[PDB]
Amino acid sequence: AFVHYDKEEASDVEISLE
Amino acid sequence: KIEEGKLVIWINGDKGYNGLAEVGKKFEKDTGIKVTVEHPDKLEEKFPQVAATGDGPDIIFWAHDRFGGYAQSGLLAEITPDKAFQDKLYPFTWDAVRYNGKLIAYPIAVEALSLIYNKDLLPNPPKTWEEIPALDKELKAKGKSALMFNLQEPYFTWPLIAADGGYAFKYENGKYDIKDVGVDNAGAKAGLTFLVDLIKNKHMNADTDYSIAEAAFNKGETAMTINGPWAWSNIDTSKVNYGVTVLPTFKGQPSKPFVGVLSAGINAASPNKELAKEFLENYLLTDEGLEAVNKDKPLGAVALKSYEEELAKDPRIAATMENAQKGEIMPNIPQMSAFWYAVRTAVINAASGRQTVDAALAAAQTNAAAEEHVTCVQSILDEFLQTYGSLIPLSTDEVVEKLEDIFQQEFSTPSRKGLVLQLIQSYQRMPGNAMVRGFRVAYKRHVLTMDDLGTLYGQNWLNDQVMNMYGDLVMDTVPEKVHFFNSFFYDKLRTKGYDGVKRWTKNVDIFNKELLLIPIHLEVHWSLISVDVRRRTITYFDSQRTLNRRCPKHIAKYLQAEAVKKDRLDFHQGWKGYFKMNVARQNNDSDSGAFVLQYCKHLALSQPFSFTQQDMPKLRRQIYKELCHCKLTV
Ligand SMILES: OC[C@H]1O[C@H](O[C@H]2[C@H](O)[C@@H](O)[C@@H](O[C@H]3[C@H](O)[C@@H](O)[C@@H](O[C@H]4[C@H](O)[C@@H](O)[C@@H](O)O[C@@H]4CO)O[C@@H]3CO)O[C@@H]2CO)[C@H](O)[C@@H](O)[C@@H]1O
Ligand code: NA
Numbered sequence: 001a002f003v004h005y006d007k008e009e010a011s012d013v014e015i016s017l018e
Numbered sequence: 019k020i021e022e023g024k025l026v027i028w029i030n031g032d033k034g035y036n037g038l039a040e041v042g043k044k045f046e047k048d049t050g051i052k053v054t055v056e057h058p059d060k061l062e063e064k065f066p067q068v069a070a071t072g073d074g075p076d077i078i079f080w081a082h083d084r085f086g087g088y089a090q091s092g093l094l095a096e097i098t099p100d101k102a103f104q105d106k107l108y109p110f111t112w113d114a115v116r117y118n119g120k121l122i123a124y125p126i127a128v129e130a131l132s133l134i135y136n137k138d139l140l141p142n143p144p145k146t147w148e149e150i151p152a153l154d155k156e157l158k159a160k161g162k163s164a165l166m167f168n169l170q171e172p173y174f175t176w177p178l179i180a181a182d183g184g185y186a187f188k189y190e191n192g193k194y195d196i197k198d199v200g201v202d203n204a205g206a207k208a209g210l211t212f213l214v215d216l217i218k219n220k221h222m223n224a225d226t227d228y229s230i231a232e233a234a235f236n237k238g239e240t241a242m243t244i245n246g247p248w249a250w251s252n253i254d255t256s257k258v259n260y261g262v263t264v265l266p267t268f269k270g271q272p273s274k275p276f277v278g279v280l281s282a283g284i285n286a287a288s289p290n291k292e293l294a295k296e297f298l299e300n301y302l303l304t305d306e307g308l309e310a311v312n313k314d315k316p317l318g319a320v321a322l323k324s325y326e327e328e329l330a331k332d333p334r335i336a337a338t339m340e341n342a343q344k345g346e347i348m349p350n351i352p353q354m355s356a357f358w359y360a361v362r363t364a365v366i367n368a369a370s371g372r373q374t375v376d377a378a379l380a381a382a383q384t385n386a387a388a389e390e391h392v393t394c395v396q397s398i399l400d401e402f403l404q405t406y407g408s409l410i411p412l413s414t415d416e417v418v419e420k421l422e423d424i425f426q427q428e429f430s431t432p433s434r435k436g437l438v439l440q441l442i443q444s445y446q447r448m449p450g451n452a453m454v455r456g457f458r459v460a461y462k463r464h465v466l467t468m469d470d471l472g473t474l475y476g477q478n479w480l481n482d483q484v485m486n487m488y489g490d491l492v493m494d495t496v497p498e499k500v501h502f503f504n505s506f507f508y509d510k511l512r513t514k515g516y517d518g519v520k521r522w523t524k525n526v527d528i529f530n531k532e533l534l535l536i537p538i539h540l541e542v543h544w545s546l547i548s549v550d551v552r553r554r555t556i557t558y559f560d561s562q563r564t565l566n567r568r569c570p571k572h573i574a575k576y577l578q579a580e581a582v583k584k585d586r587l588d589f590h591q592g593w594k595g596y597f598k599m600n601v602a603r604q605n606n607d608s609d610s611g612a613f614v615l616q617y618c619k620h621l622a623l624s625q626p627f628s629f630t631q632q633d634m635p636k637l638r639r640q641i642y643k644e645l646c647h648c649k650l651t652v
Contacts, residue, residue, distance in 0.1 A: 001566070001567040001568050002564055002565065002566055002567070003564065003565045003567060004562075004563065004564045004565075005563045005564070005565070005597070005599075008563070008599055008600055009599045010599070011599065012557065012596040012597060012598055012599045013565075013596060013597040013599060014594055014595065014596055015558075015565065015567070015570065015595040015596065015597055016567075016571070016595065017556065017570060017571055017574040017593060017594070017595045018571070018574075
């Protein structure tokens with residue numbers, strides 16, 4: 001499970017811990 | 019650095035340092051200023067290395083030949099005495115301390131080797147070198163030897179070399195020609211061959227040093243020796259009744275001893291320059307002060323005319339001056355040091371049988387005339403290899419700046435910086451100058467060899483050992499706020515859950531820390547996890563802007579489990595995951611480990627900082643250096 005991010009978002013990206 | 023209000027002096031151990039200390043005590047009784055007198059071994063080599071950085075002594079004592087090298091490097095401050103004071107000393111002593119028109123030290127006294135003999139064994143001592151062998155057969159029969167003297171320093175063996183025409187630098191039309199060197203002409207060959215013949219005839223021992231010879235002569239076990247005025251006091255105390263006489267003549271020509279002028283220079287980084295002026299001019303260079311030093315261990319022919327005229331009536335001083343006139347005064351040019359080194363090796367090897375006379379002098383000939391800048395670059399890169407093990411972390415600008423310091427010339431103009439680069443490249447191309455065999459770095463349990471430091475070169479993949487030690491350095495830089503898990507943690511936690519790492523933190527309560535750093539090594543790519551304990555956030559850093567979704571989930575399960583098993587349930591909840599945005603991003607596939615280490619460093623230190631893929635060659639060098647220092651770069 002990997003995800004590439006094309007651009008640089010403004011603030012950090014919140015992600016799931018569950 | 020150098021303390022203000024105190025004078026600190028360096029002078030060699032064979033001089034009257036206790037006698038000088040009496041002079042310093044009077045200085046302290048009349049001015050309240052403590053005066054410390056030290057005699058470090060190898061002080062002449064030390065003074066450059068420390069005076070460059072501001073440390074070192076206020077006053078430096080040595081024969082004048084060294085001071086050229088110091089003035090060349092801006093280490094000596096200019097002497098400014100009255101014309102009245104300058105008249106007090108013999109002019110040709112001020113000559114010895116003048117480098118390119120400036121005065122760089124105060125002259126003190128004049129030194130020359132003479133022949134010291136035991137009057138009772140040898141009432142009439144030989145006038146020529148050539149008759150000594152038979153004399154030694156005559157005395158060895160009686161049970162004792164003919165001659166013994168220091169064969170480990172070339173100052174003692176030089177007069178024989180120079181007798182039949184050996185010399186250091188041709189002195190024609192006012193200047194010294196440093197390309198014209200006389201250490202392998204047939205006169206010098208003649209002198210040294212006679213010497214080594216004495217070694218092969220068992221008339222002298224090749225291992226004799228200063229201490230051995232002094233004990234031999236003062237115990238009455240040998241009838242002759244060669245030394246300067248400083249020796250005389252220790253013979254006054256011995257069994258021996260001795261005289262001081264002209265050195266023997268080799269091939270009908272006088273032995274030419276190199277004549278030194280004991281000189282007191284002043285450190286240019288000294289905050290006490292005026293104090294040293296007062297001490298040298300009005301306490302040391304008086305009849306009284308020179309008397310003190312002379313009584314501990316004699317100075318010889320002092321520069322102060324008034325006291326010299328009172329000492330000159332001494333037959334021993336007269337003998338030393340005779341030998342001085344027949345010799346040649348030492349140069350004071352910076353090449354003199356390189357000359358002395360070259361000869362020391364040549365004599366030692368020739369008498370030890372490891373080299374011929376012709377080959378040892380062949381070596382010394384080339385070294386004494388070697389280009390100064392080339393030998394300096396050689397020394398700089400050799401020291402760098404001893405310190406860091408390789409030239410991987412070497413910056414060309416670094417070498418350029420060191421040379422600018424040493425020779426007080428520019429080196430950054432293109433024509434010159436290019437010559438420095440070419441010299442560096444030639445050094446690198448020689449064998450053995452690539453890396454140090456068995457080079458090691460040891461920080462706590464960690465150990466790095468050159469196989470580990472090598473992964474920082476170019477675009478190599480950093481290995482586990484480098485990463486883990488550098489993490490421990492980051493943690494120990496702020497250890498009450500940071501804890502660092504090594505790379506093996508994650509693979510265990512991923513495979514066997516909390517039970518595979520349940521004993522990881524031995525006694526560490528991670529929940530009293532502010533930041534936990536966890537590298538993530540998958541195949542060849544390095545990532546990073548950053549836990550802000552206070553804000554209860556798990557955050558994933560990837561230099562390729564790719565999230566590993568399962569990694570922070572593993573970390574979160576671990577953190578809750580640790581809060582349970584450590585009775586820290588106030589940290590059990592609230593955790594949120596984040597994928598870090600707005601950090602550096604690699605374009606190749608091979609700098610990932612370095613990105614991660616820099617991330618860690620500037621998370622821990624919390625200082626304004628940015629870097630990029632294009633900063634990686636610099637930072638790789640920096641990481642290498644920090645590792646060898648076992649200290650980060652603030
Ligand atoms: O690595 C080899 C040795 O290196 C060091 O010795 C060096 C010195 O640093 C150099 O300066 C030079 O020494 C000269 C010296 O400059 C010169 O004055 C004269 O020394 C006399 C001196 O006039 C007198 O005052 C008294 O002290 O006796 C001295 C004789 O020993 O001659 C010196 C050379 O004989 O070269 C030497 C190398 O030969 C370092 O000191 C050593 O420990 C080291 O082994
Ligand atoms: Na002494």
